Design a protein around this nucleic acid. Structure first.
Length: 73
RNA sequence: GCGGAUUUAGCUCAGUUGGGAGAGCGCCAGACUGAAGAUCUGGAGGUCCUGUGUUCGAUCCACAGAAUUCGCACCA
RNA sequence: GAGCCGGUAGCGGGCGUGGAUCCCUGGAUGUCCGAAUGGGGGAACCCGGCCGGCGGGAACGCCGGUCACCGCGCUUUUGCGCGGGGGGAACCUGGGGAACUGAAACAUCUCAGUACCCAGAGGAGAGGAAAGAGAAAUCGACUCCCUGAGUAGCGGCGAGCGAAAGGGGACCAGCCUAAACCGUCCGGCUUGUCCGGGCGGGGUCGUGGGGCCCUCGGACACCGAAUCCCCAGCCUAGCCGAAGCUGUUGGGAAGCAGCGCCAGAGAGGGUGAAAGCCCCGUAGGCGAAAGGUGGGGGGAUAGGUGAGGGUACCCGAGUACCCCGUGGUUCGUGGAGCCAUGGGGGAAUCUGGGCGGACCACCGCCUAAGGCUAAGUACUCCGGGUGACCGAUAGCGCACCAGUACCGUGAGGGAAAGGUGAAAAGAACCCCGGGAGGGGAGUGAAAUAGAGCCUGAAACCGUGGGCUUACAAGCAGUCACGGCC
RNA sequence: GCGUAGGGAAACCGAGUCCGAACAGGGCGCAAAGUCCGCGGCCGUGGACCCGAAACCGGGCGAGCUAGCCCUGGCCAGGGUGAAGCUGGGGUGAGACCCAGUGGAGGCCCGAACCGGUGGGGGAUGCAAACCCCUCGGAUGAGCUGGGGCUAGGAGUGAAAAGCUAACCGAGCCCGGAGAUAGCUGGUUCUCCCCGAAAUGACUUUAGGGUCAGCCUCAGG
RNA sequence: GGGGGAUGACCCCAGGCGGUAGGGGAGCGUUCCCGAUGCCGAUGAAGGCCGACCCGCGAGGCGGCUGGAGGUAAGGGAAGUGCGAAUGCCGGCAUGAGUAACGAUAAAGAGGGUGAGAAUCCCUCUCGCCGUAAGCCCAAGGGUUCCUACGCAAUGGUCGUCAGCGUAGGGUUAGGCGGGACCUAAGGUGAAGCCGAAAGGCGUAGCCGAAGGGCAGCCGGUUAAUAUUCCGGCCCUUCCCGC
RNA sequence: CAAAUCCGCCUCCCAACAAGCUCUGCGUGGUGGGGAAGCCCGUACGGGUGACAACCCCCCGAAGCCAGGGAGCCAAGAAAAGCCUCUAAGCACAACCUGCGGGAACCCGUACCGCAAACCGACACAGGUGGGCGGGUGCAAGAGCACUCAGGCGCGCGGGAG
RNA sequence: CCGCAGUGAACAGGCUCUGGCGACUGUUUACCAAAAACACAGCUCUCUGCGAACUCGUAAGAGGAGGUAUAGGGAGCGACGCUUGCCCGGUGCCGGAAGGUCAAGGGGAGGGGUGCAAGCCCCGAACCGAAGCCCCGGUGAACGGCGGCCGUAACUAUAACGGUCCUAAGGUAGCGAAAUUCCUUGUCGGGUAAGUUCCGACCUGCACGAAAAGCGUAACGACCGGAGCGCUGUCUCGGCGAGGGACCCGGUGAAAUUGAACUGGCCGUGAAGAUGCGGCCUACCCGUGGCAGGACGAAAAGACCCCGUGGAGCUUUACUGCAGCCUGGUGUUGGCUCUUGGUCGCGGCGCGGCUGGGGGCCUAACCCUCGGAUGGGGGGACAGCGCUUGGCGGGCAGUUUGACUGGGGCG
RNA sequence: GGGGGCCUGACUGCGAGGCCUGCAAGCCGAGCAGGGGCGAAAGCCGGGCCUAGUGAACCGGUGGUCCCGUGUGGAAGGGCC
């Protein structure tokens, strides 16, 4: 576990898949894709209880970063 | 067939003040030539896509069609 | 309760009712590997500090004990004292997660959220007091069984997939904390009124909590534990335990005959061939302990909450809600919601804020954005019970020097093979022979029951006999007539 | 929960109803009434009459096979050919440049071990799942090699034919999906009674399948 | 089908009856559960072995021989049920067949000896084949296979008194040889550090890692086997205490 | 070359066949062997063990012995014990070098096979498997060749016709 | 001096004449094929300025390379010599980006539902808006392609010339019946007793050709083909022999296939190639050493075939989709200034809110940087990187690509 | 079949009862009602002289309904034409 936020999780899942609409606005739709991928934020440098730096991403990051709910800066 | 682009001389096209129908050609003719060509002169060139309407007056403004063209829409 | 030094029957020697073998439970040793963890490493091996005797050190110096890995709290000081990790057939939730095949192709779909891998909890986890369900102003935890229903419904509307409230049933069951309001302080900024963290207030079940003013009011309300012995159940052995003998065919009787008894225990099994009464430590039925684990149930522990109005009000979360992109749901892009979220905007603290399936008015429900919660269902490694369940090519493949022999470098595969008898009384001795094996004697009911020695069939190889066979065709053969036996 | 009416997309009506504005038809009324169970011939889901393949998909398993690549040693008996050079001499200014000596390179030649394996011979239930015989190429080099290791099996490696990857890789092998599907193929058991078939027609990514008909059989009228 | 059936059965005649897929009816044995007011057997359960009574039949009964202990159901129920037959599975057993093979055309033969028995063993004497091997040696691999006394049942593609076969006993000793108690490259690990959905990936220093580096001896003797270790003669090294 | 005396770099003097320190010959201390014996003894599974031995000269001469050589060349040839410099630091009448004398020295490996019936090929299978001189005579040379030295063996089925 | 012989035995090239391809030593398909196949030294286009570009990788990271344009990767040929010509209409690509188009998106006319009403949800469109594609050009050691017929001196035949229709031009130099030439054993020549192989020459080249080079080329090859001398049982039949099985002895003692069988020829037959069925003719019972014909002999449920709306591998303008790559808006991506466009309001200009484009050092993220420390340095709002957009996209993944068919196909 | 007169039934609601037929289709048709046109009227008209000018059901558009409308008031949306 080394790709999340610290101040909460947000990684994983992701069942994408494209098609060729054309519905309600007349006739019916169609299907295709069948893949799976990722989806997340980014991480910055901080620190806690003797150095540590942290990581976690935006959102959250905007938070605790501002504040700090287990270790500040 | 969903939308946009337009509609003037034989061809290709300008045309915005709502009042002159215009240009180029090209085409025809005259001049010149031994002739034709090139140049100069000149002339013609008409369903301003059709109809109806608005207006003192319509290529121009308003109302359908049409046609051409480009893109798009496609599970009867 | 009186025999034993395990399966070894054999030699050689020995303990024992001034309670041996063994059955129990709690012990002390537990060499080396293995999470290994002192250090290294091709496991089961080889290497280091501290203490240690001091030890042969015959007039000369060693094993033993020990000890210490690393991630976890945090009495922080120089950090001293607690937990973890490795397993584990099956079953559990999360994390991740697929083709075949059906659709008589195949891209949607299906198999499925299945198979597998991963992590991790437990003895059970899962889940669990509702921003729930639905609409009779009706219901209320979660779970599980039946039912709802193969219905409402999803869909190249094709193959298929296929809910739920309500009713019946098992069980019942409820609680907390931030939740800055109050006061306590401790530490900061730097003295005020800021954030901070330990103490209580409250610490919300179905709307309340505080803070103020007057009524208060002045003892039976135990949970998931906490506790005491209680029946602590079991834990292996606990032990009594009804009642026949003669005669007899028998190698053997418990059979055939005669009389005789039992009895809540004629369950079966062992007994030389079929017993209620011979053995059975069985069902009859009562029995039983000083240690290891419960409910029931008794008590205090009891932890713990438990009434009245009023007031302008401040107090369960960082993201609800909305846009796009996926999930789960019966919903496969759909008129398509709720809950869950990948990115971006980023509200309110009770006339607040989601909800009852686009939305809107009105009505009705609920009060989130933290947490704990035994019991009712699942699963057999283990122990027992029972069988219209099997008998050695069936059953687990493996009924007992098998997951071993054996092929595979490996992962892995993975067999075959049980039976004499009543018990050995298991064949002393004599014979041919190098022996094995064969001839007698002896056990004996029988050894053509004789040592892989019960039954021991066929196929197939022999030894004798009857008939038959040399100018003759067809697997076969079957009908006629003849001779030998 | 099936029967107790049903008719209709529905509202809803109802022994009547839907189309409709018309007494013209469709569904039904007319009770004939089941229902549970048992035992059977069948039909769907099922691995489901029984074994049969090539393949796809998951997790492991291997370079003591072989192709490579890294590290580190060992190894090539003899002989032959004779370039750079350096020494000396050679007509010119020095030289180019010539010659003679020395000299000893080259994936160089002739050949053992060693590496190979065309060209013929044997062998074909061999000595052997590639070997024996005669013969041949390479023979200080993109040389042969031991020991230590690295990569890996939809991916590796490959002086590259789809080769080699533990003796058949056109995508390894074991366990798992799983007893995959399998109009095709076989296989498909004791007696006896009764009757007695088709090998056409219609539509099919259907033609050596199968739907519906046609020809069989049993129960009642 | 029909004429009367008492339950059978009997009579007429009509009237056929060859039949695979396949349709309907009726019966047979197979191992089990009843013991529907059921039990046989040591003078044989059952299976086996053999047969000129009962049935259309698939089976019955019954009698003779075998063999050591069971099980039968007069009737209804249940099912892992009837087999040549699947190049089927498993086991045995015949074929070809007393022919094909003895694993290199580097050959033997003779005398004696032992033994129950020797072309195939032991001694001995001729003879043939090596000789770059069919040499001793170090390794790697395999692990008692090595020696000695007994023995041959099977393995030895024949024998076999022989064995690298059986049982028993015994054999291999090192301050200086090799491995460690020293060193690192590849590579592998790997506190810190760096990134994964989880398992994990990488990876500094340090460590693991070898016939590469390094390190202190040699020749003779001595048993059935060992030997640079055992003998002895000769040559050394590191640590420690003392001065 | 993170810190000074080390080595690296510049300057002046001794800048040799000088002196330095690590392998072969003599040898030789002194030991062994030593074959042909060999009286006791197997005079034979012969040899275990006692004469004396002799122990000498010339000849050939390495593809890796001194040695980290020298010469040439290009594709231009691995990292940690020892030796000297020293901080921390303690010795500095007790730290390291040396000398003599006494004391200490482990863990696990060896048999025999080993161009192989004992190793891989399932078998006593004319298949493969890495290093060391490989004895001589002859052939221009040479681990090629023919015979043989030491040592090994006759293939593990023998006769008999042709 | 001697014998037939004097490396006496033993180990030890046959040579030559010619042609074709590839230069050459090589390397490779272990158990058929060592070759004209790859490899190459050598050439040419060519992507790339680093933190490269491409290859593995889920993000780290390694590789690259402690390389740095005399370099690193992509490539078609493959000494050397001589020489590589003609066409960019389509295609890939490089450049262009003014114009059309067009996604998400901004951004408002307007309509709609409920609404007593403020409101409260959608549909929404004029215009601005990305790569891509369309359109202009450049592009050949980039893919690829590089004309047809009629007439004419030609006493006879293209041709020196001429006439044309289409195309982007319309084969050039060298070569030629080559291993690209089926009419063909083409026609001439040489080689021979004749020669459909060769080798030379013509050349109407069924279909060579310069870059998967083209003509040739010393040496070079276990390559392939053509010829001459030498020599031998290869052959004119061979005929003899030596050693090894086979045969007789003793010892041992398998193996696939097979329903079963005492299995004769005939001529006929049957499902049309019979020992077994019909007629007939020869016909005693068994064996061993042999010889192959028949028993449709053995091996293996044909690989050639078709059929199952079976399977598996490679291919492109097959279908779809993903990996990666380009790409608009959005985010942790902060300041300062220079500016033009739209718009509605009050061709215009003045203003105004609105909002769009863009140019700048900075710079506090971010990243990188390092160069000896945490500071400096460089870049910097990038970008990495997250989310949605769109696009290319056979690199890969999964399916598919009918029936008839008097054999499958083509038709 | 050739002209001219007005006229459109080139109809809705239906159709007794048959052809061909495994399926679905395909095809015919008096007569009944509402409402016309042509004729004085008896009658003919529900396109053509015919037999070819073709297509399932779903996947959707649209003009009509005012049948459903997922708490009731409605609308998205759906059923029927």
């Amino acid at each position: 576990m080394q790709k999340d936020l610290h101040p909460k999780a947000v990684p994983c899942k992701i069942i994408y898949q494209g098609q060729v609409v054309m519905e309600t606005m007349s006739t019916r739709p169609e299907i295709h894709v069948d893949v799976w991928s990722g989806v997340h934020p980014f991480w910055t440098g901080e620190e806690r209880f003797l150095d540590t730096e942290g990581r976690v991403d935006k959102f959250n990051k905007r938070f605790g970063d501002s504040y700090r709910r287990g270790s500040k800066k």
